[PDB]
């Protein structure tokens, strides 16, 4: 324990008379007021060391402060008792329970899956949503994000997804998920809490809650703890691990804040240059392990700033994660059920859960045909809104009515309403019947004769 400190500038700390410091090492900071704040080591040069304070450097004496260095790297108290119990962003229990007994102490940074040991996404799952089935399939163990906008029903959609996940999946051992929030709103926290309570999955799931009132360091460290927890659940516990993370934008802005506070060289849009790799850290952690049962399925949730799909956040998210589910504000003001844009939203591998032997061979072709009819309907909608209603051909109006029906019926179901995959395929088969016989060029003759009543 070193009581020696030299300088203080902004939200950081620098100490001397120390040696052999470890990168991102756990360090206990005892202030003059008796306040104990946890911190991590930043860099070490010669006999001098520099670290960043999580709780802030506000109200701390230079010569009256003591510091204890563990020397070990970042360590989290992972266990099998975390299920059903809620934890905060700092690791402390938010459930007001007693001391949690750690089964194992492991680095929250997480270990990248070896390429040869990495197994490809397989099987399938039922999300209860038609768009999460027909338009864009969701594999079990794969990783896909969700792009929403501020003011939109992102929390409601996430709640519906989390509630209908394990419910619909059984129609394909219950599915276990993990809830994680970093620097989010108290209202959204209450909504998410009521959502997890209503879903009743809170007993079989774990929760990491980092309030916006709390520091940025804790919020950024919450994702690491959740990653280590999900990893321990998908490896040591050998169970199916679903990853639900929210408010990534706050963590991003906080990351940019930390990058700017250290006067580091910023990347695009004032963000960090390592931001891509920083996101890719927890992005590439998802996948399947050969020889090991269970898998970690990443279902992140982010909000594009000012409803801009061209924002660096969404760009880097797509550059990190493979595939995403976009939520447009255009259909959010329509009053219809949750606004998923079929065009922008896509899955990395939709061909893995398709074909015969899994569900049906009529899935993929119908998806391509429906996407084609929808896109053609959109272009025809633009043309109709441009020139006029009498300036458009028959196929234009047909695809327009087909897309409108697809939005009003197929796209609009409900939050508490979980549509079965069979119901989705049936509704899609009924949706294709609205279009003409020569309308869909992406469909085969056999499937066309089979689906048409």
């Amino acid at each position: 324990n070193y009581n020696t400190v030299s300088g203080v500038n902004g939200p950081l700390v620098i100490l001397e008379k120390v040696k052999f410091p470890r990168y991102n090492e756990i360090v206990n900071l005892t202030l003059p007021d008796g306040t104990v704040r946890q911190g991590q080591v930043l860099e070490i040069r010669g006999d001098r060391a520099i670290v960043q304070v999580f709780e802030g450097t506000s109200g701390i004496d230079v010569k009256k402060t003591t510091v204890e260095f563990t020397g070990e790297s970042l360590r989290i108290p992972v266990s099998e008792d975390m299920l059903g119990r809620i934890f905060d962003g700092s690791g402390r229990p938010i459930d007001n329970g007693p001391k949690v007994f750690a089964e194992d102490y492991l680095d929250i940074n997480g270990s990248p899956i070896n390429p040869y040991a990495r197994i490809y996404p397989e099987e399938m799952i039922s999300t209860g949503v038609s768009a999460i089935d027909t338009m864009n399939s969701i594999a079990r163990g794969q990783k896909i994000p969700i792009f929403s906008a501020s003011g939109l029903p992102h929390n409601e959609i996430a709640a519906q997804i989390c509630r209908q996940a394990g419910l619909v999946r059984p129609t394909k051992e219950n599915f276990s998920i993990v809830f994680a929030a970093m620097g989010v709103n108290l209202e959204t926290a209450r909504f998410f809490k009521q959502d997890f309570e209503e879903n009743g999955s809170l007993e079989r799931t774990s929760l990491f809650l980092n309030l916006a009132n709390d520091p940025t360091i804790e919020r950024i460290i919450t994702p690491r703890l959740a990653l280590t927890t999900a990893e321990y659940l998908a490896y040591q516990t050998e169970r199916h691990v679903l990853t639900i993370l929210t408010d990534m934008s706050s963590y991003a802005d906080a990351l940019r804040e930390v990058s700017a506070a250290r006067e580091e060289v910023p990347g695009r849009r004032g963000y960090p240059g390592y931001m891509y790799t920083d996101l890719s850290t927890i992005y590439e952690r998802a996948g399947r392990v050969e020889g090991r049962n269970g898998s970690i399925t990443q279902i992140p949730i982010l909000t594009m700033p000012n409803d801009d799909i061209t924002h660096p956040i969404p760009d880097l998210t797509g550059y990190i994660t493979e595939g995403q589910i976009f939520v447009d504000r255009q259909l959010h003001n329509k009053g219809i059920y949750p606004p998923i844009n079929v065009l922008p939203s896509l899955s990395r591998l939709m061909k893995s859960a398709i074909g015969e032997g899994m569900t049906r061979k009529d899935h993929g072709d119908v998806s391509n045909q429906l996407y084609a009819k929808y896109a053609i309907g959109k272009d025809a909608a633009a043309m109709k809104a441009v020139v006029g209603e009498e300036a458009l051909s028959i196929e234009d109006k047909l695809s327009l009515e087909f897309l409108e029906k697809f939005e009003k019926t197929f796209i609009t179901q409900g939050a508490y309403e979980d549509r079965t995959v069979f119901e989705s395929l049936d509704q899609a088969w009924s949706l294709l019947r609205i279009y003409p016989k020569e309308m869909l060029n992406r469909i085969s003759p056999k499937i066309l004769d089979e689906f048409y009543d």
Partner: protein, 65 residues
Amino acid sequence: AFIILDEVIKVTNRRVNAIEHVIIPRTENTIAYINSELDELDREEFYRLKKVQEKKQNETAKLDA
């Protein structure tokens, strides 16, 4: 002349429709993207200048000792 006036009115309405959701949206989007690019470039230049000033200040602080 009334029929020709009707056709001309149709052409005028078409031009108005083309000046509404077409030209205006394109110009607005282009202006937005250009503004973003210019602001980002200016931010990068200002960042480089700040780094230069920080380098000079660091050199001066190093020479002061």
